[PDB]
Amino acid sequence: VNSFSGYLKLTDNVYIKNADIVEEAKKVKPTVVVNAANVYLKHGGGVAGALNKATNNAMQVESDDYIATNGPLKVGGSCVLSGHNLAKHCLHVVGPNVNKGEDIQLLKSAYENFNQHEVLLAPLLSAGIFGADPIHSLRVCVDTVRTNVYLAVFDKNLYDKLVSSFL
Ligand SMILES: C[C@@H]1CCC[C@@](O)(CNc2ncnc3[nH]ccc23)C1
Ligand SMILES: [Cl-]
């Protein structure tokens, strides 16, 4: 039993809700919140910009030190950093950005990072400003993640289309 509330159950291990991931994180304080990161951990917009703003830029400060030490992530890769005031940990995961020409097949590799954590609060990878089809992203999530994932979909209209079209 966990403290996630109001989710629809899609499969044994995947759940979905219309919610602002920032407000969800502040309420649940989950063990792991997933950020929709880029390889430079430049949290300028989308989910990343919103999460970073909620940390008063502490996420960006930590991220800049991470990059200065380790260099950029790989597309499809991840790193674990602090969750600041939002969660215990933040799993920064880089899904392919279609608006940069990146290979959509890497979306499965991106979701594989979730399997290293028993429970996560997460957005749909490569959705939003990353340019991929969110219906496809949900399908890859369900077919790749085996741990317990709670998906926050900010757009209510998008949420209803994902539920109604889910196979
Ligand atoms: C319009 C987007 C389409 C793709 C799926 C999204 O859910 C991804 N963006 C977000 N998801 C959850 N919480 C968020 N807070 C701020 C941004 C954000 C919504
Ligand atoms: Cl977005």
Ligand 1 site, residue 21, Cβ cutoff 6 A:
yes
Mutate which of 154, 161, 163 for ligand 1 pocket (most atoms within 8 A of beta carbon): 154
Q: What's the CA angle centered on 9, arms 97 and 116, to 5 degrees?
A: 55
Nominal resolution (angstroms): 1.0
Least Cα distance to 67 among 96, 45, 26, 38 occurs for 38
Question: In Å, how far from its chain's centre is CA 1?
Answer: 22
Least Cα distance to 95 among 117, 78, 70, 120 occurs for 78
* Helix extents (H) in the chain: 21-28, 46-54, 58-70, 106-112, 134-144, 156-164
Q: What is the rounded distance in angstroms from the CA atom of residue 80 to the CA atom of residue 101?
A: 26
| Domains within the chain, CATH numbers bracketed | 8-163 (3.40.220.10)
State which approach was used to obtain the coordinates.
X-ray
Q: The tokens of 66 are what?
A: 């991470």
Strand 8-9 and strand 78-82: the pairing is unpaired
Give 139 Cα–ligand 1 centroid separation in angstroms: 17
Give 46 Cα–ligand 1 centroid separation in angstroms: 7
Q: How many residues in the chain?
A: 167
Q: What is the rounded distance in angstroms from the CA atom of residue 133 to the CA atom of residue 43?
A: 21
Q: What is the rounded distance in angstroms from the CA atom of residue 151 to the CA atom of residue 141?
A: 10
Backbone angles phi, psi at 86, to 5 degrees: -105, -30
